Amino acid sequence: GPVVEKIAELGKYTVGEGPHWDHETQTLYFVDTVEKTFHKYVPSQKKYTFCKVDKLVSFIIPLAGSPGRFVVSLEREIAILTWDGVSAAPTSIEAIVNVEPHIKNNRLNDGKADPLGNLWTGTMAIDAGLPIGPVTGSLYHLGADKKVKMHESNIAIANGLAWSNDLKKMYYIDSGKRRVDEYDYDASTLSISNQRPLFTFEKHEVPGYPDGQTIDEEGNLWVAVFQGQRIIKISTQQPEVLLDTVKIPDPQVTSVAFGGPNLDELYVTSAGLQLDDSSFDKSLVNGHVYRVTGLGVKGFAGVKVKL
Ligand SMILES: [Mg+2]
């Protein structure tokens, strides 16, 4: 019986997203895509701060070796944000690369560093829709040479990413496909190949859409289910195996990250934005942040981007 706790200190988010646990400073970072804000929460000291920008944002990841600098998305730009962690505006922003300069109605969505510190992230139409909408996105990684390489195309809603502990596989979610895919991942060349479905929602009566994901020390995936009011735990040893379900009060669960001193607390973001064709009445759709404990598994600290 896991225990799910609403973090009252944090309030309500329109689309809370992109949780990142920095273990060295025991700090959780996350974003609100639609409200154009970055957020910082220090649980041990009950400290909460935010930063405002004027572009759509989708991730915030500390830069390796540079305290107070972060790699972030600003619409289609990957940028370095210099932020003191407390002032409401950044100190400076420096663009690294625009991934799609000539696709004006796209944006970056989910992004994460692979275990080697390479940033992987995908794009999507700003007006992407569920269950059907424009399909214009692609999946990229950024090299330490500041050039992007494309790995996948025809993505509707570029979402959660994770890598196996032995660095042989990569897991990926296009929410439009309502499944989690697995790929063979070559750490030497950074190539992915042999795409196959790992877990298909329709085969297991799972409502909603997969969104963010993370992996634990046992190699199982924890997947946020947007419009499913839950997180699910799924096997990576065998396809199509649902291991557990944990209900979250907010229906629009968006993403997940392990954190806390012992890396055994699961932080969970959600979205209060009410969409058309929701399966839930508006009084239920709030956008709180949750902490889940007693899962009996640990995960890994967030990886910094090397760049
Ligand atoms: Mg997402």
Which residue bears the tokens 């607390």? 265
- Token pair for residue 203? 């085969």
- In the three-class reduction of DSSP (H, G, I as helix; E, B as strand; rest coil), residue 85 is classed as coil
Q: How many domains does the chain have?
A: 1
Say how many Å lie between the CA of residue 156 and the centre of ligand 1. 12
CATH number for position 39: 2.120.10.30
Q: What residues are annotated to the active site?
A: 211
Handedness of CA 153, 305, 298, 245 (dihedral sign): negative
Structural domain containing residue 228: 1-307
DSSP 305: B
Give 267's contacts (C-beta < 8 A, 6+ positions apart). Answer: 19, 21, 28, 256, 257, 258, 259, 289, 290, 291, 292
17 marked ligand binding residue: yes
Q: Is the peptide bond before 90 cis (omega within 30 degrees of 0)?
A: no
Report the C-alpha gap between 274 and 69 in whole angstroms.
Answer: 33
Report the C-alpha gap between 196 and 248 in whole angstroms.
Answer: 29
5 marked ligand binding residue: no
98 marked ligand binding residue: no
Q: What is the resolution of this structure in A?
A: 1.5
Query: For 272, phi and psi rounded to 5 degrees?
Result: -90, -5
35 marked ligand binding residue: no
Say how many Å lie between the CA of residue 75 and the centre of ligand 1. 15
Say how many Å lie between the CA of residue 235 and the centre of ligand 1. 21
Say how many Å lie between the CA of residue 301 and the centre of ligand 1. 19
How many residues can be counted in the chain? 307
